[PDB]
Design a protein around this nucleic acid. Structure first.
Ligand SMILES: [Mg+2]
Ligand SMILES: [Mg+2]
Ligand SMILES: [Mg+2]
Ligand SMILES: [Mg+2]
Ligand SMILES: [Mg+2]
Ligand SMILES: [Mg+2]
Lengths: 95, 52, 48, 110, 354, 92, 49, 143
RNA sequence: UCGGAGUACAAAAAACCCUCCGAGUGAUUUUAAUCUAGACAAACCAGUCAAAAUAACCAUAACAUCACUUAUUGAUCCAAAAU
């Protein structure tokens, strides 16, 4: 990560994150499973399903990704037609 | 002996494919499989040879 | 036109299905009997 | 060298829930390499031979008589060679179901 | 660290030395039998039976019965031996056997059954359906006198009430024909109770039809305490059970306490405890016959509540408990996306300040 | 239901048959919707249900087809209480 | 929010209400640079409106 | 209001036969290392002694609900050769009758592969079927 | 690198240039679907089970089987394929 850029002196984002993850606004990150397109003939249908999932990352990973990612990506987004707008608030969480 | 990975196609006119390990010295493979689009048990005949 | 072509193809090949699978069932049932008749006509010629 | 590759981690085969515990439907009660515990009442058997609860309730272990399925050649042979008084026993896991199946409520008074 | 077995270990009996000289069951079936007999004994280790509710297990039965019919053992035995000699003697019978053509005159078997072991079978069916559990609470009686109840569905139609059978409330709109066999020095009391379907009181029941001081087999001649009220289960709840009880009484009994008004369409007025009612008259009344049926809501019942009881009609559902979800975690790890929906309140977007 | 003139008489009578469960002792036909938090959507659900009932009742071509899945118990227990009901002697 | 703005006299219902009117009452905030294409109307207060 | 109108929200149905008849009750899923399947409300059990044929209807409690035996005088006296195919058919008919009378139309029968081939049992099942008793219990609801 | 037995005697885990056997697949047809409660395992990545509900088929028809069955396997990117 570049903490202070050369031209702007701001903090850069690591684009390699932005291609494989998704940040809901609650702070949860969402990712594909690994190896889900790989060698499908060789796998059980059950395993294949487990692979086709979208899954959530643990706290540590989340904080790591947040550090690797600038402020812009944490903003509240309203997209038209967006699949994921349903999931961006958190509900009934007693902690 | 070696086996082979063949791409098998539906005769239901629905493009659907599934790959199978098949004996190299055996005949062209044909099976009764499940096609998800038509939601039926249909005949699949091997279209292509994928991996050797 | 794409949707109607797909649906056309699917109906067309779904009308042909019982004839195909029956024909292939008869084909395989003929193959099994060909092989077994071979093995019996060989068993009786080796026996003699 | 002569000896090679003895190195593999444990499989954590064990018994996950113990007698008297509460369980929710779908909990794995045990996991095993060979049949050690057999599934009893309200306990499903997985294809890897692990036992899981089919009902919400309380786990109980029990010794009980073993009468194999007649489609199983091996077991019926083992049973068939026994002296005339003897009975195979095995260890089973059950879940004594907790909640009642359902209730009747008053929807509307017409 | 070994412990010591408490009492006998199961196979400890047979000798391991010289296994060849021991007889085996080479049959799967013999084994199955032996095993099922072993599964019925009272072992000293934790067992299936123990946890899964043998329902009080051993129970000393308070018996309020009619005394068992006294018949000579040896005489009966001789007579049956002879009858079977006769029946085995004929060549016609044997022909009927080898050629797989024979029939049993079911009416006569139903007759003999009703006469002989019927009472016991009816008893255990009643125990099964827990008649004794909701009526006398501890008590088992054997139905010595057979009770024949029937309903008129039409001119030619007759719907019988056997023990445990299903009947529709349409059939039961009228009082039934009741038949049993007694000469007359006799006095009886007949009772029809709805074992469940009381609305307010889980432990209590409804008297539908109560008759008393019944000479002999004469049904209508008895003074009716409670006029016949047709079966009325509620739409939601399934299968209420109605019970016909028959009491042999000695002295004429009069009760102004239990007597009900002639129309009597009030529910508070028919509320009943068979136990209590029996406790009262216990000295004279001994329960003799029993017949009972299963009954579920059908169309005609709607007319009852509105027309007779002057009520709205209560309707019920069958409600299953809401599914169990673990505590929601701030960072659900390696969990599918649809996770967030399990804790969802209702499906609707909500824009808080927006 | 009987006082509602915007539906025809054959339909007003056929409705009181199929839906007699949800009719009330005062003659009222009661519809209810639940789902949305918005009662516009509930009202709309009700009105669509009513539209559908009047639709199928005003269709004489409705065959009222019944599934065998939950009705197998019904047909068989029916038939089997009919074996016993078959005893013939007049009574009362 | 629309109702709450009208009630408190931020936007007036008397004249026509378009985007500029919402922005001037600070009932809403648009930032085109973020590819906001404008306001959408959602039903949260439908019954109460 | 009316003193009748009182209901209470939760209705208690004390009847043990109920939830079974409704098909909503719990069968016992499980075992499935062993045999036979203990999943059923009612099970037909046919025991063949070298002398007598005994057909029982069981509840998973082990409690015999309704039965017909050949030791029974009612059946014994009418017919001949207690061990015959004839006897099996007979007992089956009797049991069907008593079952309808008991209010139970469904039960499971789990014979042995070689008992399924035997004539006596084929005809026991036939008698049971014409009697109006279906084998193969209805499924559970929300199982 | 992966698995089985001992070390590691009875829940789990547990090392060695420790003691011993294996795997880098065949054969077969029963060609083994979709979706989802709850769990196991676990640093992460990966792995495992699985009810109910759908759809397929007897017209209330979902565990591929065998070889000690356990192991017969390989992430991203990137390339070829066009679904
Ligand atoms: Mg090891
Ligand atoms: Mg290790
Ligand atoms: Mg005697
Ligand atoms: Mg904004
Ligand atoms: Mg754990
Ligand atoms: Mg299922």
């Amino acid at each position: 990560v570049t903490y202070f850029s050369s031209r702007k002196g701001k903090r850069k984002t690591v684009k390699a994150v932005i291609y494989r993850f998704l940040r809901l606004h609650s702070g949860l990150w969402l990712r594909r499973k690994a190896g889900y397109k790989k060698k499908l003939w060789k796998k059980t249908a059950a395993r294949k399903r487990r692979l086709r999932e979208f899954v959530f990352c643990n706290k540590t990973q989340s904080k790591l990704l947040d550090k690797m990612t600038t402020s812009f990506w944490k903003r509240r987004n309203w997209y038209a037609d967006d699949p994921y707008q349903k999931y961006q608030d958190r509900t009934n969480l007693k902690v | 002996s070696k086996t082979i990975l063949v791409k098998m196609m539906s005769q239901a006119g629905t493009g659907f494919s599934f790959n199978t390990k098949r004996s190299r010295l055996r005949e062209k493979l044909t099976l009764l499989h499940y096609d998800p689009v038509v939601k039926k048990k249909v005949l699949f005949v091997e279209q292509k040879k994928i991996r050797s | 036109q794409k949707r109607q072509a797909r649906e056309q193809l699917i109906e067309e090949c779904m009308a042909k299905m019982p004839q195909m699978i029956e024909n292939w069932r008869q084909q395989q049932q003929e193959r099994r009997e060909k092989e077994q008749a071979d093995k019996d006509r060989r068993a009786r010629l080796q026996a003699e | 060298s002569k000896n090679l590759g003895g190195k593999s981690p444990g499989k954590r085969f064990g018994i996950k829930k113990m007698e008297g515990h509460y369980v929710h439907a779908g909990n794995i009660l045990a996991t095993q390499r060979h049949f050690r515990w057999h599934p009893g009442a309200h306990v499903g058997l997985g294809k890897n031979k692990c036992l899981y609860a089919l009902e919400e309730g309380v786990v109980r272990y029990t010794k009980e008589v073993y009468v194999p399925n007649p489609s199983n050649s091996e077991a019926v042979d083992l049973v068939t060679r026994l002296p005339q008084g003897a009975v195979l026993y095995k260890t089973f896991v059950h879940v004594v179901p907790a909640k009642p199946e359902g209730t009747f409520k008053l929807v509307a008074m017409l | 660290r070994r412990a010591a077995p408490l009492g006998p270990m199961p196979n400890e009996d047979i000798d391991v030395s010289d296994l060849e000289r021991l007889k085996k069951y080479r049959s799967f079936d013999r084994y199955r039998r032996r095993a099922e007999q072993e599964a019925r004994k009272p072992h000293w280790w934790r067992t299936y039976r123990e946890h899964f509710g043998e329902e009080s297990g051993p129970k000393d039965r308070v018996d309020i019965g009619l005394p068992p019919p006294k018949v000579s053992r040896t005489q009966q035995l001789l007579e049956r031996k002879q009858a079977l000699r006769e029946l085995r003697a004929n060549v016609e019978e044997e022909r009927a056997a080898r050629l797989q053509t024979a029939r049993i005159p079911l009416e006569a078997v139903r007759a003999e059954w009703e006469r002989t072991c019927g009472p016991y079978h009816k008893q255990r069916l009643a125990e099964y359906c827990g008649l004794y559990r909701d009526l006398f609470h501890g008590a088992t009686f054997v139905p010595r006198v057979p009770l024949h109840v029937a309903y008129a569905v039409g001119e030619d139609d007759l719907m019988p009430v056997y023990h445990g059978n299903e009947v529709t409330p349409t059939e039961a709109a009228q009082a039934p024909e009741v038949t049993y066999e007694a000469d007359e020095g006799s006095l009886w009391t007949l009772l029809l109770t709805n074992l469940d379907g009381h609305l307010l009181e889980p432990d209590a029941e409804y008297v539908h039809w109560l008759v008393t001081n019944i000479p002999g087999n004469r049904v209508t001649e008895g003074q009716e305490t409670c006029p016949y009220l047709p079966p009325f289960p509620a739409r939601g709840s399934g299968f209420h059970r109605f019970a016909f009880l028959l009491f042999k009484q000695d002295k004429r009994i009069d009760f102004s306490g239990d007597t009900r008004p002639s129309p009597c369409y009030q529910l508070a007025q028919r509320t009943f405890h068979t136990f209590d009612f029996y406790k009262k008259h216990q000295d004279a009344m001994t329960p003799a016959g029993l017949a009972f049926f299963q009954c579920r809501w059908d169309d005609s019942v709607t007319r009852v509540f509105h027309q007779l009881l002057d009520m709205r009609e209560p309707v019920f559902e069958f409600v299953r408990p809401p599914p169990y979800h673990p505590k929601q975690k701030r960072f659900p790890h390696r969990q599918p996306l649809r996770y967030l929906d399990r804790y969802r309140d209702s499906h609707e977007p909500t824009y808080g300040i927006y | 239901l009987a006082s509602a003139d915007w539906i025809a008489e054959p339909v007003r009578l056929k409705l009181a048959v199929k839906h007699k469960n949800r009719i009330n002792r005062s003659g009222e036909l009661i519809l209810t919707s639940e789902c949305s938090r918005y009662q516009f959507r509930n009202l709309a659900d009700c009105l669509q249900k009513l539209r559908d009932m009047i639709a199928e009742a005003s269709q004489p071509a409705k065959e009222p087809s019944r599934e065998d899945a939950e009705l197998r118990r019904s047909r068989i227990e029916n038939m089997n209480r009919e074996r016993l009901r078959k005893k013939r002697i007049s009574s009362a | 929010r629309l109702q709450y703005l009208i009630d408190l006299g931020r936007v007036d219902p008397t004249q026509p209400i378009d985007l500029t009117q919402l922005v001037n009452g600070r009932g809403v905030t648009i930032q085109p640079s973020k590819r906001d294409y404008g306001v959408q109307l959602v039903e949260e207060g439908a019954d109460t409106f | 209001p009316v003193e009748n109108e009182a209901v209470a929200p939760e209705f208690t149905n004390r009847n043990p036969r109920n939830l079974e008849l409704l098909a909503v009750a719990r069968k016992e899923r499980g075992w499935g290392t062993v045999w036979p399947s203990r999943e059923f409300w009612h099970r037909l059990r046919v025991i063949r002694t070298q002398h007598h044929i005994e057909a029982l209807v069981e509840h998973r409690n082990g409690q015999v609900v309704v039965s017909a035996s050949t030791r029974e005088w009612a059946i014994k006296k009418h017919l001949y050769s207690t061990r015959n195919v004839v006897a099996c058919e007979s007992v089956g008919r009797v049991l069907a009758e008593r079952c309808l009378e008991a209010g139970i139309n469904f039960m499971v029968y789990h014979p042995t592969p070689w008992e399924a081939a035997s004539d006596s049992i084929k005809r026991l099942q036939h008698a049971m079927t014409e009697g109006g008793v279906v084998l193969r219990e209805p499924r559970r609801i929300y199982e």
